[PDB]
């Protein structure tokens, strides 16, 4: 039974977005919460078309069109909780 085999707190914090947020403001490696210009699959030229259509695209039009099919178009979720999602 896979329990206490690898999933630790002191290894999950590297996986946490704290690291990428630190590097984003440190050297400007990570973009401003938006799309990139190089496909994470095959390093292929990301078109501005995919960038402006999809806020945070990581797939060139070739690798994207196949995953666009695999997009569920639903959540079926239940995450009870309130947040600051406003403009004051
Ligand atoms: Zn690609």
Curated annotation (Swiss-Prot):
Q: Which Pfam families match?
A: zf-dskA_traR
GO molecular function terms attached to this record: zinc ion binding
Which terms under GO biological process does the entry name? positive regulation of secondary metabolite biosynthetic process
Transmembrane domains' residue ranges: none
Q: Which InterPro entries match?
A: Znf_C4-type_bac (IPR020460), Znf_DskA_TraR (IPR000962), Znf_DskA_TraR_CS (IPR020458)
- List the dksA C4-type ZnF regions, as residue ranges: 39-63
Q: Which NCBIfam families match?
A: PRK11019.1 (NF008243)
The name on file for this protein is Uncharacterized protein YbiI
- Source species, please? Escherichia coli (strain K12)
